[PDB]
Nucleic acid binder design. Structure first.
Ligand SMILES: [Zn+2]
Ligand SMILES: [Zn+2]
Lengths: 189, 276, 263, 323, 136, 283
RNA sequence: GUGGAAAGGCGGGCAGAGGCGGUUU
């Protein structure tokens, strides 16, 4: 029932060698109550709101596997714009704002046919082992339909995923991402 | 459509001891991990919107010409008849209280409150242009917590009977007077025509916040927040693609909320008005 | 609103001891009848001779405001009033101990919430408290929320025999029942919040920075020193085994009494 | 109506929480001078030490604490007399002597409590909510709370014990007094008490304004709430809100003139025969603190007396008269 | 035990006089550790209770440590030492037992860096007064 | 219904202790009954709860003494009878002291519409159920001046340890007590901010707030003032009306009442129409 | 072409009523 592993223990799980789980999770999902006040007769009417709070040095990262010319022109200018607006959520209260840094990480993965996805994928064929993540979304105030994604850590055999285009009746087409991010894995027998 | 982001950075000083509260019997809001208090972005934006809606409620007749969406509103609330938007300014009912929220994109585009703070609406929306970040303690006010000093204190208030002088005590955890936080407001410049009016209106509501209170009891003298502006940077549209420092920086070291509008808006902002 | 959630621990091991399918028939049917049939009599005040005396805040009513949502073979989700969710947590475990021979136990997570909180969020928090009380020692209750140090020697959740021992020790000195403090300790509502402000000095930094004499000072200026003698002097028995001080475990006994004698 | 100025007819002294050892004091002449230690020590520190504190911590032999500052070379209260002496000091807020208001309020209450127990009666005051009373108090009496029962049946009665004197029932909270103006440096002087101890006090011939005021608005609200035997004796006359002041200054006059006639029972005897008569603290004896003038009494005081009677410089030790 | 002395406190001053004379033999600042500092303070206040000294008589000295404590904490010592001597003058008697612990601490403090050693001195002097009330 | 903003009247001055005051709260060494202090500077202040709460108290007894006279000026004062709801334990049984807090009864209007007509609850606010009329005044916490902070630097005494004794009458045994008291003469910067919500009856609220101040200069301010611990005095530094435009344009053109060396009784009785004649011109 | 857009944990609440640092030898 553990959810995450660090780099020392993630490599050992791909080769089906023994490993340990982390003891502390770097965040907590916190229930903060807010209020709505009448302007004249200040009647309080509360509602409950969920937030992820991080530790003093903890945070969030994501990975990128592609050519440097595309990263330098598209993903790197986007993360400086997205540092000042939000990254999903109530961004008018300062939620989702962050400072961006760039590093390089290495994963030692075994060579096989089967591979784990480090992202939601929207698979093009039947996977091998998986967990259904059912989510929709919201696009310029238009509700996106709930699509059956695959979860992070699910196992495919030569499946690229596929990028879905939804008409959605909007000035422009809406593309939902859905692509794999494979690292090789050894399945059991 | 996008042009840049005027960023206001400053220090919020609690001249009198501040209370926000989360529900020592009445604890203030804190971080879940370190245990330090802060000021939420919801409390500061929601107070600046509340102070500025009462400002616009008093001036609906005089601002029809500048803001054409205020011709549809009469001053008052829709509370005396349990009915949605019809003539009164405080038209939207959320749960039990009445708020001005414009019902469309095209109406909120010409409202002084809702072009800045945003509108929910039905069949269309209007997002905010400001981002009011949370205000945590300064780094200087954090080692006092590390040295062992109290950053919150217990204020014990009583309630006296007028005939018998029967006393009825209660306690209120309160952030200690003197403590300094750091705020930030990020204004998204969406329209190159609307931005001078939006910064003046944001600074007006920050000037009403210095004579009113922020959170907590307030009428009993709690809030009393003072604004110190460290700097103003512009971050243009060309900054986001190339990353080089084209940031137009307006300098304010000891300037007040009134001195940034005491003819200073027209003068100091001579370069942001230049590069649009 | 009090929300309790629990299960029976190491139950999949116990069903794997069975030789014949007639032993699995007996083991899975007596196990199911405690939660299907005999958990409703525990709420109705029955079987109290076997249970004895449990940590209570009031005399047990004839019709408790307790709603059983779900109670499967080894699981049980129960909502209701917080002072009777608390007493039911100990009344069930003490009767579960008698139903088995002491061989199987209970992890219980307890929660205390605002009423107008969504029920997917009440269930989400106590599920995160029932496994917090399960990976540690697995025979341990999670009574109330707790701030702790990060040194790894401090666990948030009380063992079952531990918390009933702290209730026989600490509670009949300061508390009389039914939301009333003990005689000559009335108008000391501010006193018991001071002892939890002293207790938060231990959380910022252990190894006795300031808390040992401040406890002796506040017990000193009020004339009451029979209240909690284990808190004023440092415990050499606590230092030799690297277990927490007796000022650390009194959070779960004070904070339940402070909510019950709120008004 | 306020500004009820007082004149002193005698030496008057308020004890305070301090005494003056002779390290602070050296009379160079007959005028006793009171110096401060911080200006004497630190100015001598530029001329030089632990030898200054060693004579201070000794407190031996005083005369030796004087010549060191006299040769090889301050100001304070400068209270003249006009050694091995211990001057009991007066109360001073900034070195300025004033009369505390909580002392003047207490001298009134011993007179008012006397008149309430003299007019009685008491069975009607305990006729409601009890779950001339001196004769039963001797059998009742057969760092002390002896007035906890007598004043509860006379000022404020609330329902373990039959009467326990909650403060909220008391008709004395409408009478407010305030601290007087500071007297001055010249009317504070040191005197010697001869018991038939050196003390600084206020000689006769001073005038300060104590501001006594009555709050009428509290008695209008508390007409039903008060349970005092004082209250019954003060409402029975009628117009209790406007009759409280009348009762106030007549208890001031009739008590202390009755004490003055019993005190007469040579040069001091001329002082007794020769405004409102009032007698303050530390100078008045146990009888002028006590309803023992009304008080059986010798059997009670033997277990719980007119033996000692102090005097300084031919005059009794407190007589202050208001308007 | 800290609680065990209260059962015995409620000629007995002589048995604790060896504990006070041993603590007065060590006079160096910060010569004891953090746990040893509080263990000395239990022996001091138990010694100061058999021949009992009230906190008021000390209350002027306790004022001068506390007004400096705000002035030390981001805001001299001989002013406290001059008062700690003169208050010990007007004894009567157990003020010398309290002077034999202050004046060795204050002679070392008399010349010392202000920010550290006084803040460590202030923690010991609290526990003397704090523990003195716990026993009476 | 229809909350509007016209500006703020700000009253700045110096509360002076003509006799030493005592507010107090329930350090290790120290007086048994100490005085409230600032937790960051250690200097004794005066809270805004203690100054608003005493002004609301003294103004409520000022209404019950004259319910025949105030009834014609203000509606919803004929909703009750003079006295308290203390015998009949009822939240609204027709008396002026209608709402109990925990055990004691304080005059609080229960509805927004009856609080907009009451003189006590327009100026101070109500909080009924479903009602919540907010206050029109802010009474800040009152710290020491810049002068009397320098006196703490130089070593002059700000506080004091007053010692009192209750004497047993029969046995003449004395029980002593010590109470911390600010030294008489100390001064405190206060601030009172009235929100001009309605230009109809801003003028009645300024006269009702200044009426309650002169009552508080006759009575005490906190902590055993029947013994002398009050005798407090308002000294007015500045008096200033900030118009709505002030917050728009930021210019320091906001109209001012001199109020120099004038008492709380001079502002109402001597020159209320002469001083406030220029505030009325902008409104 | 962001499970989004909009929403002050708030309104009202005196740490207060009583008390001669002076008795007595
Ligand atoms: Zn709008
Ligand atoms: Zn009213």
């Amino acid at each position: 029932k553990a959810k995450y592993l660090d780099l020392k223990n993630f490599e050992l799980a791909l080769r089906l060698r023994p490993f340990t789980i982390p003891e502390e999770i770097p965040y907590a999902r916190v229930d903060v109550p807010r209020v709505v006040l009448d302007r004249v007769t200040q009647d309080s009417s509360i509602y409950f709101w969920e937030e992820i709070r991080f530790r003093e040095k903890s945070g969030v990262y994501f990975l990128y596997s592609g050519p440097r010319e595309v990263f330098d022109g598209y993903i790197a200018p986007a993360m400086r714009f997205l540092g000042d607006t939000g990254i999903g959520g109530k961004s008018t209260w300062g939620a989702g704002l962050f400072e961006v840094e760039f590093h390089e990480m290495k994963i030692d993965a075994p060579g096989s046919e089967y591979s784990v996805t480090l992202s939601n994928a929207l698979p093009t064929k039947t996977p091998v082992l998986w967990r259904l993540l059912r989510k929709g979304g919201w696009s310029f105030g238009r509700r996106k339909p709930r699509m059956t994604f695959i979860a992070e850590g699910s196992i495919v055999k030569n499946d690229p995923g596929g990028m879905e285009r939804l008409e959605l009746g909007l000035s422009h087409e809406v593309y939902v991402y859905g692509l794999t991010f494979p690292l090789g894995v050894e399945l059991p027998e | 459509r996008f042009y840049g982001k005027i960023v206001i950075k400053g220090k919020i000083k609690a001249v009198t001891g501040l209370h926000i509260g989360s529900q020592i019997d009445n604890p203030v809001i804190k971080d879940p991990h370190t245990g330090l208090p802060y000021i939420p972005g919801s409390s500061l934006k929601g107070r600046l919107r509340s102070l500025f809606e009462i400002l616009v409620n008093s001036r609906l007749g005089e601002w029809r010409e500048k803001y054409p969406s205020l011709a549809n509103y009469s001053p008052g609330s829709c509370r005396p008849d349990n009915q949605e938007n019809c003539g009164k300014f405080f038209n939207r009912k959320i749960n039990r209280g009445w708020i001005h929220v414009c019902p469309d994109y095209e109406t909120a585009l010409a409202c002084p409150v809702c072009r800045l703070f945003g509108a929910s609406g039905k069949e269309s929306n209007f997002p905010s242009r400001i981002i009011v970040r949370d205000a945590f303690l300064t780094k200087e006010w954090e080692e006092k917590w590390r040295a062992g000093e109290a950053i919150t204190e217990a204020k014990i208030e009583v309630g006296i009977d007028r005939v018998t002088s029967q006393a009825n005590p209660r306690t209120n955890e309160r952030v200690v007077a003197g403590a300094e936080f750091e705020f930030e407001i990020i204004y998204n410049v969406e329209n190159t025509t609307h931005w001078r009016d939006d910064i003046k209106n944001l600074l007006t509501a920050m000037a009403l916040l210095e004579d009113s209170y922020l959170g907590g009891s307030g009428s009993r003298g709690y809030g009393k927040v003072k604004f110190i502006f460290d700097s103003f940077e512009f971050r243009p549209l060309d900054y986001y693609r190339t990353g080089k420092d084209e940031d137009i920086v307006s300098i304010d070291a000891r300037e007040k909320s009134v001195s940034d509008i005491l003819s200073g808006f027209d003068s100091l902002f001579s370069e942001v008005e230049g590069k649009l | 609103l009090g929300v309790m959630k629990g299960d029976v621990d190491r139950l999949g091991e116990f069903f794997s001891s069975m030789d014949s399918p007639s032993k699995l028939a007996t083991a899975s049917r007596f196990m199911d009848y405690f939660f299907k049939g005999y958990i409703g009599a525990i709420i109705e005040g029955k079987f109290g001779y076997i249970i004895g005396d449990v940590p209570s805040l009031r005399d047990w009513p004839e019709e408790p405001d307790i709603v059983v949502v779900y109670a499967g073979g080894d699981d049980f989700f129960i909502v209701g009033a917080w002072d009777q969710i608390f007493e039911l947590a100990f009344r069930v475990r003490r009767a579960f101990n008698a139903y088995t021979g002491g061989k199987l136990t209970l992890s219980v997570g307890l929660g205390y919430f605002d009423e107008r909180t969504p029920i997917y969020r009440m269930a989400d928090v106590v599920s995160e408290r029932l496994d917090t009380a399960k990976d540690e020692g697995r025979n341990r209750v999670f009574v109330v929320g707790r701030s702790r140090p990060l040194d790894g020697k401090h666990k948030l959740s009380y063992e079952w025999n531990h918390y009933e021992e702290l209730w026989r020790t600490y509670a009949p000195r300061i508390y009389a029942g039914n939301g009333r403090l003990k005689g000559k300790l009335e108008s000391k509502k501010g006193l018991l919040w001071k002892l939890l402000e002293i207790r938060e000095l231990y959380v910022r930094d252990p190894n006795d920075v300031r808390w040992a004499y401040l406890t002796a000072y506040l017990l000193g200026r009020h004339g009451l020193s029979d209240l909690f003698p284990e808190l004023v002097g440092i415990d050499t028995k606590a230092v030799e085994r690297k277990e927490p001080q007796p000022v650390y475990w009194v959070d779960g006994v004070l904070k339940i009494v402070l909510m019950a004698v709120r008004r | 109506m306020t500004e009820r100025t007082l004149k002193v007819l005698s030496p008057l002294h308020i004890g305070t929480g301090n005494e003056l050892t002779p390290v602070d004091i050296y009379p160079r002449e007959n005028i006793i001078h009171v110096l401060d230690t911080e200006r004497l020590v630190n100015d001598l520190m530029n001329l030089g030490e632990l030898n200054e504190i060693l004579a201070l911590l000794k407190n031996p032999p005083a005369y030796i604490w004087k010549g060191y500052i006299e040769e090889f070379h301050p100001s304070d209260y400068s209270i003249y007399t006009l050694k091995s002496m211990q001057i009991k000091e007066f109360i001073k807020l900034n070195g300025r002597p004033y009369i505390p208001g909580s002392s003047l309020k207490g001298a009134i209450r011993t007179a008012v409590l006397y008149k309430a127990l003299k007019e009685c009666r008491a069975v009607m005051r305990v006729v409601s909510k009890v779950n001339d009373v001196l004769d039963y108090y001797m059998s009742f009496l057969s760092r002390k709370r002896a007035d906890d029962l007598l004043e509860a049946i006379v000022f404020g009665m609330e329902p373990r014990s039959k009467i326990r004197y909650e403060p909220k029932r008391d008709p004395m909270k409408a009478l407010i007094v305030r601290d007087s103006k500071p007297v001055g440096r010249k009317h504070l002087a040191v005197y010697h008490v001869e018991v038939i101890i050196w003390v600084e006090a206020i000689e006769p011939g001073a005038a300060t304004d104590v501001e006594i005021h009555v709050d009428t608005e509290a008695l209008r609200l508390n007409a039903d709430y008060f349970n005092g035997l004082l209250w019954e004796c003060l409402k029975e006359r009628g117009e209790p809100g406007e009759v409280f002041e009348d009762f106030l200054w007549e208890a001031v006059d009739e008590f202390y003139t009755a004490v003055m006639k019993y005190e007469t029972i040579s040069q001091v005897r001329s002082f007794y025969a020769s405004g409102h008569v009032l007698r303050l603290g530390w100078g008045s004896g146990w009888l002028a603190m006590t309803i023992g003038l009304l008080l059986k009494w010798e059997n009670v005081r033997k277990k719980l007396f007119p033996k000692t009677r102090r005097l300084a410089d031919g005059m009794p030790m407190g007589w202050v008269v208001l308007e | 035990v800290v609680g065990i002395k209260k059962m015995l406190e409620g000629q007995w001053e002589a048995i604790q006089p060896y504990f006070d004379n041993v603590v007065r033999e060590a006079k160096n600042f910060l010569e004891w550790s953090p746990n040893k500092r509080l263990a000395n303070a239990v022996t001091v206040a138990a010694y100061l209770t058999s021949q009992g000294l009230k906190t008021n008589q000390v209350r002027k000295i306790l004022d001068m440590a506390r007004t400096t404590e705000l002035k030390v904490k981001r805001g001299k010592d001989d002013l406290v030492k001059m008062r700690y001597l003169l208050a010990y003058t007007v004894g009567k008697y157990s003020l010398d037992a309290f002077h034999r612990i202050l004046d060795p601490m204050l002679e070392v403090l008399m010349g010392s860096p202000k920010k550290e050693n006084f803040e460590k001195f202030y923690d010991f002097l609290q526990a003397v007064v704090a523990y003195h009330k716990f026993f009476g």
